[PDB]
Subunit: 206 residues, 2 copies
């Protein structure tokens, strides 16, 4: 079943998640800002809609191409984080899509009381915006999983990252392992409106 | 301690809460859309800033007049619920205000799973928008209380409405009792980031 990815430009979690789908020969639709990145992704077989996730027109088109049975995966970041996500969720519903995995971060939502002051100073506003995105998703018609990774690191997947629920967490996780967890959640029979923290215990930056 | 009220135009919860403050000769500041309602409230001794709660200048002006020791009370229910409350909350921080009581509705936030399909059809988007407002407040620098009333009814205060937490709730409550509960929370030593449902058990419309 097709995947529609937002935030898969660049080299982060989205990029790695898209590469897993491609290696699988899975139908993939993505929205990408840069025209040149678009064609290079298109040559790998991605159906690339060029534009911005705040563009309701571009978003609707991508949703239409993916189809009502598609899974949306969002790893978006940046200026217009809440609005971009509201657009995606709203257009998803209109297109008959009913499943979405949203990747935010530790500190969002009910994990906010455990966010450190140092982390809040650096990422506070981004986290609050992503929290609005979680909210809009949780009150939407979509089935969902929300994944809140801790500090993102590069490197090879370790397979040691753990999904944790309903409890304070702090730590790090490799981007490659967040992609693996997205893949696992996506392939399960249902998302079941779940919220998870995601860290590899005791993993640390060098 | 001065009260800065949003949504106190009209005759609803805000208006009744404003009455309570005036009756005890509390300094009161308010943002009011219509000039005639404004002048009328002003003759009762309200410092009334005329304009819309999405207007940052007007909101800052009111915040300045209230001062850093003020309590904000919001009973707003417009068409741009989220944006209005974000403006209020942002400008409050800028003005050094550190306390806010936000009145939303049963069905907001983590009470969303228990909202009836009928109520969702009638009030769905308004509740989701108010839920975004709740979120922004809960991740702000302000100490807060959120009050979520059941179905609102006119009529005299019964004194029998009850604050309920962390459990599914259904029912009705007099607007006047919502104003009484706001006053009690306000005069307590601290809001302490609490969320409450508010209904009168066995109360019915007829």
């Amino acid at each position: 079943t097709p995947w529609l990815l937002f935030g898969a430009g660049g080299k982060g979690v989205g990029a790695r998640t898209l590469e897993l789908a491609l290696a699988e020969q899975r139908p993939v639709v993505a929205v990408i800002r840069h025209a040149d990145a678009a064609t290079k992704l298109a040559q790998q077989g991605v159906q690339v809609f060029t534009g911005d996730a705040c563009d309701a027109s571009v978003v609707a088109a991508a949703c239409r191409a993916a189809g009502p049975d598609a899974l949306i995966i969002s790893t978006m970041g940046g200026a217009q984080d809440y609005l971009a996500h509201r657009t995606v969720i709203d257009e998803a519903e209109k297109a008959g899509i009913s499943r979405m995995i949203l990747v935010t971060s530790l500190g969002c939502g009910d994990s906010w009381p455990f966010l450190s002051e140092r982390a809040k100073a650096a990422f506070g506003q981004a986290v609050r915006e992503k929290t609005l995105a979680e909210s809009w998703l949780q009150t939407s018609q979509l089935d969902y999983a929300i994944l809140r990774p801790g500090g993102l690191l590069d490197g090879a997947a370790t397979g040691k990252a753990q999904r944790i629920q309903n409890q304070e967490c702090h730590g790090f996780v490799r981007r490659a392992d967040v992609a693996a967890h997205i893949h696992e959640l996506a392939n399960a029979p249902a998302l079941n409106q779940q919220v998870y923290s995601l860290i590899e215990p005791d993993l640390k930056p060098a």
